[PDB]
Each structure stands twice: as structure tokens, then as C-alpha cells.
Design an enzyme around this catalytic site. Structure first.
Site, PDB file in Angstrom:
ATOM      1  N   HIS A  78     -31.148   6.744 -54.944  1.00  0.00           N
ATOM      2  CA  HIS A  78     -30.176   6.459 -53.897  1.00  0.00           C
ATOM      3  C   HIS A  78     -28.805   7.006 -54.257  1.00  0.00           C
ATOM      4  N   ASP A 111     -34.965   7.622 -50.954  1.00  0.00           N
ATOM      5  CA  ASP A 111     -34.020   8.030 -51.997  1.00  0.00           C
ATOM      6  C   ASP A 111     -34.221   7.188 -53.257  1.00  0.00           C
ATOM      7  CB  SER A 153     -28.115  -0.567 -53.795  1.00  0.00           C
TER       8      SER A 153
END
Lengths: 151, 46, 151
Positions: free
Chosen positions: C28, C50, C102
Site C-alpha cells: 500500500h 496494493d 492501515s
């Protein structure tokens, strides 16, 4: 979702709201919006219902519940209060003025909102009425008590 | 000379597009990295 | 499986781990690996996500659980803690910074790990979000909250 009134020349013509996004925008009668700030936007229509679609803002997230069509005869609250009848509409008594009362939703006691009024006040001492709701398949049930008192 | 040149270039272009499409077809199964139930395809993990 | 941070110029860009082998290698954003010792190896990619595939070492056996897609609205923990919503993503409140966040997995209270974040922070006071998980058929559900705040 607060029952935002529709000020029809100072009225509350539709004490409307948004049940999770789509607002109860009634093209039914009239009224200057209460949340005109929010209601600065335009809306869809509803030919089968004389209504309009809200699709409220992302800022307006977390609006209200949209309870399913699952409902026995149960006391769902309104401005006039609650009433419990299913085959015939909710068992309100004759003596509530549906005209103007349009905009009362099915405030079922479980925090459930699945319906809102359409008209058809009363002939007997009870008051079943016309509504709008989800159908047996959950379709947008537009309930029309035959011989409907306007709102 | 011109015809052999052009036919070879056409064939090799087709070949690269083949390889492109083939790796693209590879790309799906990258779900399987989850290491779960099989979906009966040409490649094998019995 | 410890939330091995990804030191993006001293960040923790991905506090990643391996849920039983396959590591949560996020392509990502970025980050120098925490377990670079373990993470000395190379990985796959994930175009739809990703990300990258870990397939951790035999020495790295007994990594973490991979709970199934069976999930009601339930408080699955994270760095920000737990949150309970299913139709909409977990019922976190607006006020957590998904960017950087994340790498938080669905730490369901049953010791269950079935999902991990993807973005989509909040508009209303609550915070449902974008995730990655198993789908209804258990497929690699890449959850994308429409209009996603990056991470």
C-alpha cells in the site's frame, strides 16, 4: 432524524426526516423546510406517492433506522402516538386529524421505523389509515386505505 | 525480404500479447494465498 | 503475530504481521520492515489490494489465526480498539486517523482475525471503514468504503 416540519405559510405541513439517507420529502402537500439549511438541496419525485427522495449528505450520515417489513399488529408511535393493528392498519382510534398529521412514521416500539402515513382516517371508532412502507417482498408498499381522508 | 520481416514482427507482437494475457489470467488465483477451499481449475493443489 | 511496523523514514507505516503464514505485507504505502530479519525475504504483489504475500517460514510456524468470514456486527479490536458494525463496517466513531492506521486487523473478541483495514474513515460521527477480509463465499473480500480516506 428529527421530524423537520414543513412550514406551509407557518404550518408544519410535513414533519419529515431521513430514515438513513433518503429523506421523507413529501411532495404530497407543501411547506417551507425546517432544516432548509440541510434542505437547501433539491430532490427527486414520487408519482405513486407524491413524495421526493432525500439521499442525505455524508455529513448527514447516521440519520435513522429503516426497519424491515416484518411487523405484527403492534403499537408504532406517532405524533398522535402508537397503535397496533396489522391486517387493518394500526389500531388508532377515530379522533386524530390525519390531514396535517401526514409525516408521522411507524415508530415501532423496537426502535423500528418501517412505515409512514398516507391518509384514510376513520369511519368506525378505530382509525386504521393509509401509509407508505415496505411490502411483503419488501417492495415500497404505498398503503392506500380505500376512501382515504387526505393525509 | 519485406514479407518475411513483416510476418515475423506480426507473429512476435502476437506472442507478447499472448504472454500479457496469460499473466493477466494468472492474476485471479491470488485469492488462494488465503489458503482455503479449491475451485477446480487447470492448475493443481489437491 | 506481532504488528511488525514498517519504518517509513522512521514511521510505522505498516504494523503488519502474518496470519498463519501469509504475511500482511502491504504494498500500500511504504516502510522499513520491523522484522527485517524475518523480512529479509521478498514477496508477491496484490494489484486489487496494493499488498504482498508473506508465506512465512517453517521456522515462522504458528503465526496467527485466520478466522472465517462468519461475523455479525461485533467489536473487533485494533490499534484504535474495537468496533461493532457489519452491514456498514465496524462501528468505530469518527475521530481515528485511518491514514497511518492501515495495518489494523479485525481482532474479533473470540480471538478471531478475519479482516484488516483499507481506508474510508468517516463522514458521520461514527467510523465505518474500508477493509480486506474473506467474502460471503470466503473470497478475498477487499472492502472499499466508497469515498475512502487513504488508509
Amino acid at each position: 432524524d428529527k421530524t423537520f416540519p414543513i412550514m406551509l405559510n407557518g404550518q408544519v405541513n410535513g414533519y419529515a426526516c431521513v430514515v438513513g439517507g433518503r429523506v421523507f420529502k413529501p411532495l404530497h402537500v407543501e411547506g417551507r423546510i425546517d432544516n432548509e439549511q440541510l434542505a437547501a438541496i433539491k430532490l427527486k419525485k414520487a408519482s405513486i406517492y407524491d413524495l421526493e427522495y432525500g439521499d442525505v449528505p455524508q455529513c448527514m450520515k447516521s440519520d435513522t433506522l429503516q426497519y424491515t417489513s416484518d411487523k405484527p399488529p403492534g403499537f408504532y408511535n406517532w405524533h398522535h402516538g402508537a397503535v397496533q393493528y396489522e391486517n387493518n392498519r394500526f389500531t388508532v382510534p377515530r379522533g386524530v386529524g390525519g390531514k396535517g398529521d401526514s409525516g408521522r412514521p411507524i415508530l415501532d416500539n423496537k426502535g423500528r421505523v418501517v412505515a409512514i402515513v398516507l391518509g384514510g382516517v376513520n369511519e368506525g371508532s378505530r382509525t386504521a389509515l393509509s401509509v407508505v412502507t415496505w411490502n411483503q417482498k419488501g417492495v415500497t408498499v404505498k398503503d392506500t386505505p380505500e376512501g382515504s381522508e387526505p393525509w | 525480404c519485406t514479407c518475411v520481416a513483416i510476418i515475423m514482427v506480426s507473429c512476435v507482437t502476437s506472442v507478447w500479447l499472448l504472454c500479457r494475457t496469460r499473466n493477466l489470467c494468472i492474476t485471479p488465483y491470488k485469492l488462494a494465498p488465503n489458503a482455503q477451499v479449491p475451485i477446480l481449475l487447470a492448475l493443481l493443489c489437491c
